[PDB]
Design an enzyme around this catalytic site. Sequence first.
Site, short mmCIF file in Angstrom:
data_model
loop_
_atom_site.label_atom_id
_atom_site.label_comp_id
_atom_site.label_asym_id
_atom_site.label_seq_id
_atom_site.Cartn_x
_atom_site.Cartn_y
_atom_site.Cartn_z
N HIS A 124 0.84 -1.20 0.00
CA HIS A 124 0.00 0.00 0.00
C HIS A 124 0.87 1.25 0.00
O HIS A 124 2.09 1.18 0.16
CB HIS A 124 -0.92 0.02 1.23
CG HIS A 124 -0.18 0.22 2.51
ND1 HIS A 124 0.39 -0.82 3.22
CD2 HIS A 124 0.09 1.35 3.22
CE1 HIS A 124 0.97 -0.35 4.31
NE2 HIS A 124 0.80 0.96 4.34
N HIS A 168 0.45 5.85 0.97
CA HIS A 168 -0.47 6.88 1.43
C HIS A 168 0.18 8.23 1.27
O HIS A 168 1.38 8.35 1.02
CB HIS A 168 -0.92 6.66 2.88
CG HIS A 168 0.11 5.99 3.73
ND1 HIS A 168 1.31 6.58 4.06
CD2 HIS A 168 0.12 4.76 4.28
CE1 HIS A 168 2.01 5.74 4.79
NE2 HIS A 168 1.32 4.63 4.94
#
Lengths: 382, 377, 376, 376, 382
Positions: free
Chosen positions: B90, B92
């Site tokens: 992931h 961010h």
Amino acid sequence: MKKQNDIPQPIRGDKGATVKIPRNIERDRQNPDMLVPPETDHGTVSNMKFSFSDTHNRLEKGGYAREVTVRELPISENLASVNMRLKPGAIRELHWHKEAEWAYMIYGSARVTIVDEKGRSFIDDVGEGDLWYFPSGLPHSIQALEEGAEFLLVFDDGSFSENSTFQLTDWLAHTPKEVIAANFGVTKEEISNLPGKEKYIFENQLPGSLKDDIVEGPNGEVPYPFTYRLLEQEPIESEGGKVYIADSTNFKVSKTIASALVTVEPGAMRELHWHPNTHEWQYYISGKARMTVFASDGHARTFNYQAGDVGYVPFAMGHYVENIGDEPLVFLEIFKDDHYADVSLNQWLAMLPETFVQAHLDLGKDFTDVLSKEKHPVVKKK
Amino acid sequence: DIPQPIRGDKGATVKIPRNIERDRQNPDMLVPPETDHGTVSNMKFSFSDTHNRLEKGGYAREVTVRELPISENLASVNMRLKPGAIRELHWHKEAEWAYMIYGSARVTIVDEKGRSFIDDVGEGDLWYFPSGLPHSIQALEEGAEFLLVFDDGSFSENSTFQLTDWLAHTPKEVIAANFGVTKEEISNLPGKEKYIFENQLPGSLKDDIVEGPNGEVPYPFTYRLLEQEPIESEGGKVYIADSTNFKVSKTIASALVTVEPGAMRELHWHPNTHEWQYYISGKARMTVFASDGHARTFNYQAGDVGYVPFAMGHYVENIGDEPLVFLEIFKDDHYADVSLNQWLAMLPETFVQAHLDLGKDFTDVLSKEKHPVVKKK
Amino acid sequence: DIPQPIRGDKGATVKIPRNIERDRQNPDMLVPPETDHGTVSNMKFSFSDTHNRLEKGGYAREVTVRELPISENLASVNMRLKPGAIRELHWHKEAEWAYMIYGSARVTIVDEKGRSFIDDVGEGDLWYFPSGLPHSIQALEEGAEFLLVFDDGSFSENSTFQLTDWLAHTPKEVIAANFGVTKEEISNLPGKEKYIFENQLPGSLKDDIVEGPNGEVPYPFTYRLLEQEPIESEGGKVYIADSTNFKVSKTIASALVTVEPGAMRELHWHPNTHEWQYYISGKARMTVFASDGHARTFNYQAGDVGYVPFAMGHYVENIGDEPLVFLEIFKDDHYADVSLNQWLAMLPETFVQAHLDLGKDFTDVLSKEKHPVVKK
Amino acid sequence: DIPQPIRGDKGATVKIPRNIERDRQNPDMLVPPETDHGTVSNMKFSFSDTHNRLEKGGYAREVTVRELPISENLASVNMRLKPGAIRELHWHKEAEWAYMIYGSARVTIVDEKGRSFIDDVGEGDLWYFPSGLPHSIQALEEGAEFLLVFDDGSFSENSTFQLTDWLAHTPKEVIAANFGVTKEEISNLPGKEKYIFENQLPGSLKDDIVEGPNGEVPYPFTYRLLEQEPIESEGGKVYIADSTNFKVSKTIASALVTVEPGAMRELHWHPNTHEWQYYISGKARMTVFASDGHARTFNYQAGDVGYVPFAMGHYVENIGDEPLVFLEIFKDDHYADVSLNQWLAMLPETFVQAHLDLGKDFTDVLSKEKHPVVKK
Amino acid sequence: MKKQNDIPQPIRGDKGATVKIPRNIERDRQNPDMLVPPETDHGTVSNMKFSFSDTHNRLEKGGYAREVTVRELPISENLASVNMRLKPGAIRELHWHKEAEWAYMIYGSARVTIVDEKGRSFIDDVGEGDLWYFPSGLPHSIQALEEGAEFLLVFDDGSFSENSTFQLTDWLAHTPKEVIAANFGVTKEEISNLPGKEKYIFENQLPGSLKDDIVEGPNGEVPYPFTYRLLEQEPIESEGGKVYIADSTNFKVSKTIASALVTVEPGAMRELHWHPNTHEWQYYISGKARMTVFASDGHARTFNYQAGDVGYVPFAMGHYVENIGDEPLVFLEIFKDDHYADVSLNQWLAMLPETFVQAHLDLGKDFTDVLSKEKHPVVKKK
Ligand SMILES: [Mn+2]
Ligand SMILES: [Mn+2]
Ligand SMILES: [Mn+2]
Ligand SMILES: [Mn+2]
Ligand SMILES: [Mn+2]
Ligand SMILES: [Mn+2]
Ligand SMILES: [Mn+2]
Ligand SMILES: [Mn+2]
Ligand SMILES: [Mn+2]
Ligand SMILES: [Mn+2]
């Protein structure tokens, strides 16, 4: 150039009328270009002028302090200022604050202390025309010498308040005694005489010689001084006055404040220019001025200033500062940036092809021939 | 014991139904110091007072600006992974800093030049992932539990950009075209994200390293904090990692502080930025001095987040019988403080005496060397 | 020839009066991919949907935060000049970046040290004017049409500081004192701004150069983007100008992307800042992946502005028969992206397989080299 | 004759160049009461410190939130008209309240039902124009000078919607179609607004009345404040106009206060909203008590605006030899205050004594009747 | 009145130039008054136009929904809108939301349900030209009848989103089963078949007769209906068209939305006026229009609209809506207020002394004689 009556009236040619209601004649006389603006003004522009005389003065044993902040002059969101006065020997209590602080010594002299992020101390005496700059959060003090002192402090946030600094004795008065005792390895009895409230400004005997106050330490000397002798520098000297500039390129510690002292002889003016970097904050030390702020899209407003006034010019707005009195005009220009920069209208046009300028202005070689490729910040009338 | 909000002749017994357990945890809030005064924002929040997201393989719970509104610039996740479990690949918007409290894990990261860095992190080690750079965590044979800190308070652990969530929300024709495969070749892609999932243990780190034509990253994304020599004072130790030594950690400066029983992190403030705190173990109190006669004391213990706004005076006192261990976090490229003791020690003694109304007996105790953690006598 | 919002068994025919022409331009919005989900802000605005300011000599129309509110940090003007026409000497707080689409123009700029730079700009060239430095544009013999991008979304083309507007709003006594002339000598100054005005063609660049006591500027304010060697992928070309090569361009990083029919700007995101887009030619679709299961697809064609908020996943697919040509703009000192393909290619293959529920047949196709534009 | 910021052993002489005239106007700011403390926002601004817009026929100057930022909800214009001069037909979002200080004027207004109201306003009279209803002012034979107050602090006198400005910015084809005339018939429309313009004196009020099919307005837009019976205290008079008596004045409650020399508007606060002040004549000081030990004293004289935030304690003391006359304005549908004296008078005397550490000698002086202006 | 070429160009007299870059000819043809604005436009004005065709359409089994919100049209902070379509029998799932909802039935018909703060239900059928209004927070549903339905929903906050309503099945899917069981006095087994996710819009068999659906309860009938037959009312009929108004004075429940349907014949126009109460939000049902928004201080901008477009007029700004096509122009005007109000330019001037108007306009009795004291909202060209 038509002069006002002893009782001035807001009349310009066939525009305006007499004032029919009770009025403030004294203030009207101070603001001739606001009671009767130039015909060339137009549109809404925020207020750009505020007087320290219109502020509450905090009086203490040893001096006073009054401030102009965003709560007085809301256009100035990034800069605020205190006019502070100390009697001989009086101390502005050891303190710190979130904002960086820049200062100009108008009258007298003082000793300052500061300690940095490395535990290194710098102690120095400041006289008339000298500056200091204290980076954000570093603790400092001021103590006036034998003549007393009066100076201008400028803080790099408009929401400052002089009543909200962190004071040494206020911190200790609001820390548990057990914690203070443990912090220093002493008993509570040994600290029983600590003050119960802050001092802020207090009377004290004059300090001794500077040499006897210097403190050496294991972390060595600071790399750059926190004071600067502005008026000892060679100024930019134009026909109509002088300009002394201190920014981070020469006053190395002054990373968030660029500054200039400008002197303008009678019949002279700080020329038409703007700043391509940031807003300008002004303090008028002496004399009388007018300035038109050109705000784009046909908006322009003229303001008057005299000793004790704060002014402002938002980022990139066109302006000039004209002496409208018989004595020298002396003012400070302050910028929240790491350098001073301006663009001169004259120099700009002088550096372009003359026919191109003529095509813009609908003027001929008679005008373009007067343009100067050298910047002269202060010009003298012919 | 049944504590009561009584201090000398001030206060009274509690007459309404109350939370005795919490009152026992907050003695300096039920009974504050007489020296506290004025309104101060809340500076304390417990991870135990947060919703815990449970998944096959571990859990994650967070303290954000929606829990602790004074902390607008920093938020945190307490994350736990079982052996072999994976925190899904992931990225961010925020930079992420981490401290490994328990166990160990393998991290991956790829940079904007396509260079990968893969490394194992153990207890006392850190990582820092710059904003937007994609990464993963996989716990090793004993599992892992760690603290993540993100450089924006509005973070949420449920809003990271997950690999499988991206693919599940991209047209199949586009995925197929992107990789030069058929739609049938990608028919088994997940329909929703995994977030945390169980998996077999990985092999040796050496066998996982991926070699590529763009070479190694110039600076490591992990740091062995507890292997560094700490600043040692009479009452404890301080280990600092900021961008001057942990070179990639450009937006987070950090310190691990240990405070022996009877010791205290001395009176100081930070001239650069706000402090965010996590209490790993022990019990503490801290008074935050907010200027203009305002000061408020808070209690902390393991699992608590604390905060000290920019330039406010503070100390951290051990109030228990075990060591106090906590993290100090700052959104800046370096750590900085001003020590009250050192400050006064570096000034003329008569000038300090004039301020404090104390004599040479006091100024003689001041030290020009900074001692971050002091011991009581 | 009448499209309907129907996808399999979802949707229905439109029963109310409708805009069939716009529906035909937006096939992936009338019928989005099944993989779209959730609320996403609008990321698409057409210059054709803006008021065009017409003047003697050209025109200017703008897309700002008042048209496209997601784009708070960047705004844009499409400006056209007829041969010889002048965009009046002016300045503004915002830095300005430009791409010359058609024709050519001469620019002037003077810096804060009094140094002037004058240069000619042709198709495929850029300029960048730092905040507050005064400048002008004059079209050459073919006229000019170009895209300006400003590093604040609240810009307006009607709010620039114009030379003649300043003088028209300054007391005549002050102008006269400033230059050492009489009021009579300046009586012919304009009473209002010009903004854009017609003029005879300029002479040779050599004849316009002005020498001064402060010397030449250290870095040029123009850049010949299309003269640079592009990154050439299977499906097209990418030309990048940021502060690492176009040294003055400190707040704008830019790229020109060409995508052949059947090709696509690959799946990627930006780890540094938001992307602002201008579509020069062709037809595209893009899905913006906004995290937490949110994704929305948009259509673009010539004259459209697009946007991708910081770190959101995206791709740009050519959906037409002609080349797709667009600009990518970032408010930063450098360009950066992370490529989905390269990311996965640089991880252990079994780790990728564990995520994707796919096998070695898929991980074998991953490439450790970044290819920004791929061909089907 | 040279005041200094010295109070007993506190303060010092001013050593730098200074504004002695302003210092003399602000004695309680150069030398505040010892009882002041803490940071309080500025509550004082002079119309003399504002730009005056001069036109053929009069002038207008304003104090807005851009001058006095504490006053976010109320702004004000001091407007002057020569005999016969017209403030051009216009409207604005803000409701407008007015007090006629000098002279007289004719006002017009038309409501949303097409009903017109035309009336003459003299010294001591008010008007109130609800938001968005169009109106005009024309001075009569003596001219007029008046104070306008608008119920938003962000107002500007240069941003009103003017009849001729609207028409100048509407396509001629649309104006012609709107009225059923040819473009040639409207060719003489002004190209820009008038704002304030000179005109011959109007005729009798009776000759201006326009009858219409929708009848008369239900409530008048003018009010004869000084014809009302005032509340007469020992030290002066108070005249109140709010929506309970001036029915249309739904968003502005107002009072005119006269304070004799040696008198004072008593200690009180407002439990409903902020107070905005205009000083018509005389000289005053006021301390604003802002809670938590914060209090700041300000000086006022003719031409000054003042302000008291919601619920802050205050008084207004005459510090001169002439009557003090000022307006109090509140953005509410009614006037309300709590009087310190009346409050304590209505409580058990021993309870008050327990608070104040004073005895029956003090509680015996308290009055259960409210006296807004008290005499020393 | 000069007409464009098949390929229009942004040229007006001697101003403007041909477009030299790739362009959107189709959109340019839709926006003639934006490619070539009136000479009378001036200054910066926010965008006041957005097309539903430029929005993402959410497709479901049974219909679709697309929205224009503040994220598309940022001037409209207080109002947002959904164009929703249902197939015959399809259900917009029982739901509620923070915003009040107003609706106009453009095509077809539907059955609505609502329950109020007192537990009283109202169930009714709505056909073409009918409205509904659901107060904030009251739960409701829509089910299309035999022709299907297509309608416009308007919500009284611009930050709405159609994907953020509170859905019955979504609530239950996110409530512990033990709590649902306890709430209703049933076992977990009895509720095992509850959906795991929301339906939003779903296909269903046509409902029966309205009479058979009415539910009576112990709390009695609602005091006011939640539907209104707008097109059954007598309109204000002018020479050039008709106006039907529904606000809280006649559609009693509609406390936060005032509405009007306006029809404008070819060659007609909604006259010059403004609103003294609040902003206007517009939806164009059919036809083609232009409107100039006059924003004060010399600012004015013209916009074009056609079927499927949303428009906006900020509070008190001057405007008109001119039919620029060959077919009737039909649009909705929406206001977040408890009543409709306008001021007509013609009626205003008609109600003033003629010489006073003449003094303003520099026109004579020939002009003031044409003014009408009766308001005619839609005028026809001569
Ligand atoms: Mn200081
Ligand atoms: Mn300047
Ligand atoms: Mn992460
Ligand atoms: Mn600390
Ligand atoms: Mn420019
Ligand atoms: Mn991109
Ligand atoms: Mn008015
Ligand atoms: Mn009052
Ligand atoms: Mn609904
Ligand atoms: Mn309307």
